[PDB]
PDB file of C-alpha atoms (C1' of nucleotides) in Angstrom:
ATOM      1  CA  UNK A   1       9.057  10.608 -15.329  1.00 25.37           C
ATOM      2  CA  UNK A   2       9.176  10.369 -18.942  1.00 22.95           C
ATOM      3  CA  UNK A   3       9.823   6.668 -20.596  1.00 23.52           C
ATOM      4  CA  UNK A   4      11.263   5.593 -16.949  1.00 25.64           C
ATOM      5  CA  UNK A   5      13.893   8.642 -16.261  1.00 27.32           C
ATOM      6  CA  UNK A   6      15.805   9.122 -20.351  1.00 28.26           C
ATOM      7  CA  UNK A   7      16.177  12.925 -19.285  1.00 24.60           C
ATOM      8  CA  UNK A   8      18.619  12.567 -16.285  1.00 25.50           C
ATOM      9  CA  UNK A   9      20.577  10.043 -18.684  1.00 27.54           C
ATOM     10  CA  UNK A  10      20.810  12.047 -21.674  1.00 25.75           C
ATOM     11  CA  UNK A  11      22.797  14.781 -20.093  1.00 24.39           C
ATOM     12  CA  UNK A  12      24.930  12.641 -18.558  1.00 23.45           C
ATOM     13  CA  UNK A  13      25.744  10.505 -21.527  1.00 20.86           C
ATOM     14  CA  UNK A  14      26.360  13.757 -23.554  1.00 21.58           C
ATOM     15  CA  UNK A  15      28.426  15.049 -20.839  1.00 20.28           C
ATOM     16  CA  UNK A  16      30.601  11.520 -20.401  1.00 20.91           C
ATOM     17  CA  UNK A  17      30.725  10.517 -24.030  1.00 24.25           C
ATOM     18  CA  UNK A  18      33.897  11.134 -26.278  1.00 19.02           C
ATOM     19  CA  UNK A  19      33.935  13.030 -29.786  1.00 19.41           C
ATOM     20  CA  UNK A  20      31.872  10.370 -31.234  1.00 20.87           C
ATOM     21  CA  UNK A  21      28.451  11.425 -33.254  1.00 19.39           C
ATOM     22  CA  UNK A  22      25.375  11.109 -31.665  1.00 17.12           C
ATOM     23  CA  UNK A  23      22.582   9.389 -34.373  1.00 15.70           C
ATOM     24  CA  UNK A  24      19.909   7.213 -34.261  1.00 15.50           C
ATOM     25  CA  UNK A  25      21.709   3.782 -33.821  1.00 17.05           C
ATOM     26  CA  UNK A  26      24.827   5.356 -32.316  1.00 16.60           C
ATOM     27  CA  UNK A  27      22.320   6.308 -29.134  1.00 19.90           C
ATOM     28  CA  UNK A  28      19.624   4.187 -29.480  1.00 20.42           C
ATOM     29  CA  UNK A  29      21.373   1.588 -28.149  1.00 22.50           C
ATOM     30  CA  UNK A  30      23.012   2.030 -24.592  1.00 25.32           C
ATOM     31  CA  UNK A  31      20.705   4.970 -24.253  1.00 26.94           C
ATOM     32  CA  UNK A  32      18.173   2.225 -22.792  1.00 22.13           C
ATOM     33  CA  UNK A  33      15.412   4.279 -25.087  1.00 19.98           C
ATOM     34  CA  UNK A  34      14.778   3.263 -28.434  1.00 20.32           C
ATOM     35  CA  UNK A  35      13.950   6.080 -31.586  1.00 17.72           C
ATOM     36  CA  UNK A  36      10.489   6.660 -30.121  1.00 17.98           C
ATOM     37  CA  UNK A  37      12.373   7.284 -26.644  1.00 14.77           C
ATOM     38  CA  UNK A  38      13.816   9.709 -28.023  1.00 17.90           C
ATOM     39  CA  UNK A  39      11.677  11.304 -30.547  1.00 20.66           C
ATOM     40  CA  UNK A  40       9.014  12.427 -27.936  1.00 21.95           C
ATOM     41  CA  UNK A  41      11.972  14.330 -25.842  1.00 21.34           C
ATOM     42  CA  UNK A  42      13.273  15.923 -28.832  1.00 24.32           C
ATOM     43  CA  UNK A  43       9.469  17.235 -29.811  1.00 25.95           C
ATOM     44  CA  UNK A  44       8.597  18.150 -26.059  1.00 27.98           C
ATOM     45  CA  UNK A  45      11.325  19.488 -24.231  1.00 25.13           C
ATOM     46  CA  UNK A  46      13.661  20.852 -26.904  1.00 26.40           C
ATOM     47  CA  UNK A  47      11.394  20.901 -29.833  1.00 28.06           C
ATOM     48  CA  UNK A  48      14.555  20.951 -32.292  1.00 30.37           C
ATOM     49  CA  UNK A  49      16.213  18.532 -34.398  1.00 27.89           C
ATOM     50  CA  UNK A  50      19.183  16.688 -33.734  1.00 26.18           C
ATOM     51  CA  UNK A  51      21.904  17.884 -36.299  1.00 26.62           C
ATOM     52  CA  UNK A  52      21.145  21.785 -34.898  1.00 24.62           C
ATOM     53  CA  UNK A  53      21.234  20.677 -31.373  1.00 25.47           C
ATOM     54  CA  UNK A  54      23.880  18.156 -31.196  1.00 26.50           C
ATOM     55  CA  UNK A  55      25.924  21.703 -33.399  1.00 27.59           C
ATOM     56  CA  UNK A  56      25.218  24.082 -31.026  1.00 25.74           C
ATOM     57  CA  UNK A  57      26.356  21.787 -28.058  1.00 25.98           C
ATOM     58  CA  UNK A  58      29.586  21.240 -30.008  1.00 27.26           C
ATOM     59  CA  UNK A  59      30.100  25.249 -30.994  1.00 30.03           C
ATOM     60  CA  UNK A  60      29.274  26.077 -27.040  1.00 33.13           C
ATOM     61  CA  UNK A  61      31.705  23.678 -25.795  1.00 32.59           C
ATOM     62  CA  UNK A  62      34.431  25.288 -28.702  1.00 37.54           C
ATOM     63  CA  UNK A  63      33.885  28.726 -27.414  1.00 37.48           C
ATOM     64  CA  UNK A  64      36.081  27.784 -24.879  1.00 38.72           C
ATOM     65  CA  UNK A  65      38.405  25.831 -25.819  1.00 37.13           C
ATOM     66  CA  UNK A  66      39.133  28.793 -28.538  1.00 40.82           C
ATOM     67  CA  UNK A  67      39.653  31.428 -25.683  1.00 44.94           C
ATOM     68  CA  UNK A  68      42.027  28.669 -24.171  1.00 48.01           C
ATOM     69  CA  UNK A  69      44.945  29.921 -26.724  1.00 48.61           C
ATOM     70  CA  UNK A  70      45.668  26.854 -28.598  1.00 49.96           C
ATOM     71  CA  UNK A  71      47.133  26.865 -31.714  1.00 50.90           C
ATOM     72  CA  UNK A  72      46.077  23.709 -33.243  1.00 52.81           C
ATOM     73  CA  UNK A  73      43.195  24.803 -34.402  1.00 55.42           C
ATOM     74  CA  UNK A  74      42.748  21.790 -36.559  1.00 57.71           C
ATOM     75  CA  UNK A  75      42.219  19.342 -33.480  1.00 56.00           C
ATOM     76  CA  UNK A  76      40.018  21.659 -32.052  1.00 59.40           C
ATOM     77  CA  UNK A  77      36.826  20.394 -34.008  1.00 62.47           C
ATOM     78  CA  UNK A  78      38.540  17.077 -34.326  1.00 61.89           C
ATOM     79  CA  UNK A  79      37.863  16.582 -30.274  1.00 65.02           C
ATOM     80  CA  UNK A  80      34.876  17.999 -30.055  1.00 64.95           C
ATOM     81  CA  UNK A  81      32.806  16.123 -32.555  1.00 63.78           C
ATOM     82  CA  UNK A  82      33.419  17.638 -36.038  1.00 66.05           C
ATOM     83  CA  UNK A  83      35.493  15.033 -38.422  1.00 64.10           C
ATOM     84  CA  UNK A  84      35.857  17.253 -40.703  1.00 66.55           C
ATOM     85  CA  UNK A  85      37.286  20.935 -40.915  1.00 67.38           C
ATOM     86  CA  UNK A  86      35.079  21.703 -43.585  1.00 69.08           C
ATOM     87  CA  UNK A  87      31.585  21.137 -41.728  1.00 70.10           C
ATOM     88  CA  UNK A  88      32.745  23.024 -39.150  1.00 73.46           C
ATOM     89  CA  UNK A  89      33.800  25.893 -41.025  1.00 75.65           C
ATOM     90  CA  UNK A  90      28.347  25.374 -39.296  1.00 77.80           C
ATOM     91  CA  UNK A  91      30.393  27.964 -37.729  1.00 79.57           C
ATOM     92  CA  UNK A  92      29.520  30.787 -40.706  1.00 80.29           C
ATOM     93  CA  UNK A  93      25.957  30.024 -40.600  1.00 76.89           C
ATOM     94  CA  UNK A  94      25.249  29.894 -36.849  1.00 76.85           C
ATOM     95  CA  UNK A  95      27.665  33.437 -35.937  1.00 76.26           C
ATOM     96  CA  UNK A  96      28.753  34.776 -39.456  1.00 74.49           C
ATOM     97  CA  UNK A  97      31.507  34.967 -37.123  1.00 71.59           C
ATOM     98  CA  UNK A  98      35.478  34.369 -38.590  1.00 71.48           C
ATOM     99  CA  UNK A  99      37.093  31.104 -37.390  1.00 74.13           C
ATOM    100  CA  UNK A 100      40.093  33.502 -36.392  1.00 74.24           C
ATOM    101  CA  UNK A 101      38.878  36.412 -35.546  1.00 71.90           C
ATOM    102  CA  UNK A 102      36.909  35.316 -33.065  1.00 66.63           C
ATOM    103  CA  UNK A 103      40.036  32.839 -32.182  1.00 66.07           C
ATOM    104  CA  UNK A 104      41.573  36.347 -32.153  1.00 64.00           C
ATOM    105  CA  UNK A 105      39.167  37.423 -29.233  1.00 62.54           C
TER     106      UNK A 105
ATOM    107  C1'  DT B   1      44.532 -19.357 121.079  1.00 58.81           C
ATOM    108  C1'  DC B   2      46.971 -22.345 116.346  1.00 60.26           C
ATOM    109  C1'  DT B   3      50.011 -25.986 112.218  1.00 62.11           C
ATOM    110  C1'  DT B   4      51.137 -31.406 111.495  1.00 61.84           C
ATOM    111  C1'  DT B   5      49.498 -36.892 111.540  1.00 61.55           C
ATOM    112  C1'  DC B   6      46.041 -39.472 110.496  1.00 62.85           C
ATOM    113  C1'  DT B   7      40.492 -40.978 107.368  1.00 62.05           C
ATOM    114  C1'  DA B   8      38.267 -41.005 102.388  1.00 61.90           C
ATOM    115  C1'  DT B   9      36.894 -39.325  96.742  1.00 60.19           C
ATOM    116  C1'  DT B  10      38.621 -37.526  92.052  1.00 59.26           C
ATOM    117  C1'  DA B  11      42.475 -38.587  88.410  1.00 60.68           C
ATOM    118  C1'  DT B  12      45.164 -40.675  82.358  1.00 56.96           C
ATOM    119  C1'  DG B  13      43.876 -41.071  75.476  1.00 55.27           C
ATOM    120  C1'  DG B  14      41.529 -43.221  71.781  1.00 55.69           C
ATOM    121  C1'  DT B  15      42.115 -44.180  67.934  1.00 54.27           C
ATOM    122  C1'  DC B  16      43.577 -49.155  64.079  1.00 57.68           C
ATOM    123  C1'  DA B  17      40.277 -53.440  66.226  1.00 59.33           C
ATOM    124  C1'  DT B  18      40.113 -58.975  67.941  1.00 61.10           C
ATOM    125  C1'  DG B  19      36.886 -64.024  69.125  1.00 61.99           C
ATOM    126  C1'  DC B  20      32.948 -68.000  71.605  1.00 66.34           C
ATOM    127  C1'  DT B  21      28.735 -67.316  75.495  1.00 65.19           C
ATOM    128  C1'  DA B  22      26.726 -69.824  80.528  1.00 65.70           C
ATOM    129  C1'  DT B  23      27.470 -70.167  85.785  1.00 63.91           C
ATOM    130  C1'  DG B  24      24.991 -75.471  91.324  1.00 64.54           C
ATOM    131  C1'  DG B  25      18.952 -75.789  92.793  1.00 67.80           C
ATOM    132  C1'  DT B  26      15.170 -75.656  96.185  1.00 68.41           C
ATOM    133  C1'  DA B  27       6.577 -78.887  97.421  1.00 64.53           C
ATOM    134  C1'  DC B  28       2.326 -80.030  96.316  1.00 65.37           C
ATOM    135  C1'  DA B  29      -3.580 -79.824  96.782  1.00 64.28           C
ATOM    136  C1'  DT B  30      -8.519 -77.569  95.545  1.00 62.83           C
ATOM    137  C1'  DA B  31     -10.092 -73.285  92.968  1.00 62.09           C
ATOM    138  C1'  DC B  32     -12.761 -70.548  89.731  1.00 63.02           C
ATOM    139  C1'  DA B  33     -12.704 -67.778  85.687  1.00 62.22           C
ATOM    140  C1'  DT B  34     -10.221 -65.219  81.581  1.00 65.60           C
ATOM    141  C1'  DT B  35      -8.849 -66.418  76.959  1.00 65.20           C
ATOM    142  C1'  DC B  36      -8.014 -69.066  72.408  1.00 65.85           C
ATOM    143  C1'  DA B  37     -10.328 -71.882  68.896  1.00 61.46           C
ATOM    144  C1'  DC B  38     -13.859 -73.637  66.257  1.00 60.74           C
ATOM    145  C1'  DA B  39     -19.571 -74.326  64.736  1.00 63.55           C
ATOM    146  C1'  DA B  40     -23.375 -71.387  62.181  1.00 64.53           C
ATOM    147  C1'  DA B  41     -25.982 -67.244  60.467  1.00 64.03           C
ATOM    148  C1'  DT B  42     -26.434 -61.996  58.851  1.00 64.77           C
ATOM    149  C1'  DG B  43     -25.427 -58.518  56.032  1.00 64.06           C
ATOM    150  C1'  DT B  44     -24.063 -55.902  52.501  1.00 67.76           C
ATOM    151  C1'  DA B  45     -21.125 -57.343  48.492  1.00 66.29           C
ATOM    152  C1'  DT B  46     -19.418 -58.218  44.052  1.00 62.98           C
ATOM    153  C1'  DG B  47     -20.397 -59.634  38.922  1.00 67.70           C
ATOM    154  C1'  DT B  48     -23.890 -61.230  34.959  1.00 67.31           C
ATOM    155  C1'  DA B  49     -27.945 -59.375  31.940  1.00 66.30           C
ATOM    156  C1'  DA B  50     -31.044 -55.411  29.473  1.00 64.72           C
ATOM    157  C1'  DA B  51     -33.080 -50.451  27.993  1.00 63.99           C
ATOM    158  C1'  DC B  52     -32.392 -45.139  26.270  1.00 64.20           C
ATOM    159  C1'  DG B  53     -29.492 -41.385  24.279  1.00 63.48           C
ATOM    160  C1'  DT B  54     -26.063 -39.182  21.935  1.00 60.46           C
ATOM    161  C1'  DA B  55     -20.864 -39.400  22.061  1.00 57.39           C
ATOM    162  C1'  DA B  56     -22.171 -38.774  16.557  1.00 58.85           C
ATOM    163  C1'  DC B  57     -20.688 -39.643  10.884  1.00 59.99           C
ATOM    164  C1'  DC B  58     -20.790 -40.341   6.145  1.00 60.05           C
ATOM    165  C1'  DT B  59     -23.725 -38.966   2.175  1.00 61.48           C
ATOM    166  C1'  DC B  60     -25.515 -35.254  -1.130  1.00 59.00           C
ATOM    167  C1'  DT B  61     -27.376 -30.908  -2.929  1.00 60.52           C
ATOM    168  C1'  DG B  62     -27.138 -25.756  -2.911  1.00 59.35           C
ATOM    169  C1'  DT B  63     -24.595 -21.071  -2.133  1.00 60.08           C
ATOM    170  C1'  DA B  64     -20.283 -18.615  -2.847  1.00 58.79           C
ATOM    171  C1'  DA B  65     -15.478 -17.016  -4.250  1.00 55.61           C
ATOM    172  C1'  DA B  66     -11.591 -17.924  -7.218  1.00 52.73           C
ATOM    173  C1'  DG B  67      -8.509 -19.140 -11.239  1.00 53.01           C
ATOM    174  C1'  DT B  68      -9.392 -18.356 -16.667  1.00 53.25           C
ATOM    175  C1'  DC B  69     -11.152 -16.778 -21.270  1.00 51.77           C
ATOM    176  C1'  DA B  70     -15.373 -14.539 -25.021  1.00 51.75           C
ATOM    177  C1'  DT B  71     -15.448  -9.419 -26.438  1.00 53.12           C
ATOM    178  C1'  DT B  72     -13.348  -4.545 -28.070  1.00 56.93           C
ATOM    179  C1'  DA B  73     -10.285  -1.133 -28.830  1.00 54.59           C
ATOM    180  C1'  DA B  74      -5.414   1.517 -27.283  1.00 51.28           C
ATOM    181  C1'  DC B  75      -1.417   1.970 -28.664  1.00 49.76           C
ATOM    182  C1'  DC B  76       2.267   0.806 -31.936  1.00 52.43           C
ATOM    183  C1'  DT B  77       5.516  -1.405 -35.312  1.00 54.59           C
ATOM    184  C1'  DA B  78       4.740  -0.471 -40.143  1.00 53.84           C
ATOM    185  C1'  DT B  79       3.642   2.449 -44.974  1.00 52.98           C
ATOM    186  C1'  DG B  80       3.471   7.146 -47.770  1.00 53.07           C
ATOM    187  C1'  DG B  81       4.275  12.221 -47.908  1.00 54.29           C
ATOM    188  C1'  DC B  82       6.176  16.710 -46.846  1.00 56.04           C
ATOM    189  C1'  DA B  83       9.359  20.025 -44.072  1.00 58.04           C
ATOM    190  C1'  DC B  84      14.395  20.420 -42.311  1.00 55.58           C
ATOM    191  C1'  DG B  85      18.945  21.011 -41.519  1.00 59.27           C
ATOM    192  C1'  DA B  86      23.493  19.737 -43.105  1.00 61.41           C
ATOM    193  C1'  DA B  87      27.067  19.706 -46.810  1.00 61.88           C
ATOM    194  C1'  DA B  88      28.945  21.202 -50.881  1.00 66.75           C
ATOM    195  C1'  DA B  89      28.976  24.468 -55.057  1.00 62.57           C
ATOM    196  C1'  DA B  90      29.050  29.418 -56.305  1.00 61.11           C
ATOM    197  C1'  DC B  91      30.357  34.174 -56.344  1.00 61.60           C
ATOM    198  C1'  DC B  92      31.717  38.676 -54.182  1.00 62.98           C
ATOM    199  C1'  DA B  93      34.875  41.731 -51.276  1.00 60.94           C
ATOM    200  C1'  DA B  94      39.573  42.967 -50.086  1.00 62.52           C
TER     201       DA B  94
END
DNA sequence: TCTTTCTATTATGGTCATGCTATGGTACATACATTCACAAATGTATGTAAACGTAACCTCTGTAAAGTCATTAACCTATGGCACGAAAAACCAA
């Protein structure tokens, strides 16, 4: 039990929650757990920041949806999280890995 | 040895219930005591005082437990300072 159960509500608001960004206000809110809430679960049981975390989530959940043959490939970042193609593109410094190539695979 | 013509007790119901009640007389004289009904006195009786004790009973000071508020410092919004991770510019390979 840390700051009355924000663990077994974190999850599930990641998993339930739409495209929208995840930032300070955006989930300090609703979350029930202000910044402090939050801060200590970020430094204890992840121990990484937000922006890399909330990126990896996004490029784990893509991995999928790009071996799902679809070939809008625009929309595909567009309903995971990523407004923009551009910041997406995170992808060449997390795998050094082509957008289509591995779209290929 | 046996069936008719006489001499005497049982029997047939109560339910719905009725008024107004007696009917003739036929001797006294002594007698002695049981019983009812009142005088008057006893005896236990009832109702009026007076003494002790606690049914107590409020009053007040001391012991005790319960709400609250002096400390003091634990954490917690702030402030400043330094990494950190994203986002865009740059340049190289094909």
């Amino acid at each position: 039990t840390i700051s009355a159960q924000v663990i077994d509500t974190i999850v599930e608001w990641i998993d339930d929650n739409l495209h929208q960004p995840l930032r300070i206000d955006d989930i300090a809110r609703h979350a029930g757990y202000s910044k402090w809430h939050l801060q200590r679960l970020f430094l204890q049981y992840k121990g990484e920041s937000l922006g890399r975390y909330i990126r990896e989530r996004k490029l784990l959940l893509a991995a999928r949806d790009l071996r799902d043959t679809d070939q809008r490939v625009y929309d595909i970042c567009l309903k995971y999280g990523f407004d923009s193609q551009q910041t997406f593109t995170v992808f060449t410094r997390t795998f050094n890995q082509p957008p289509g190539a591995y779209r290929k695979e």
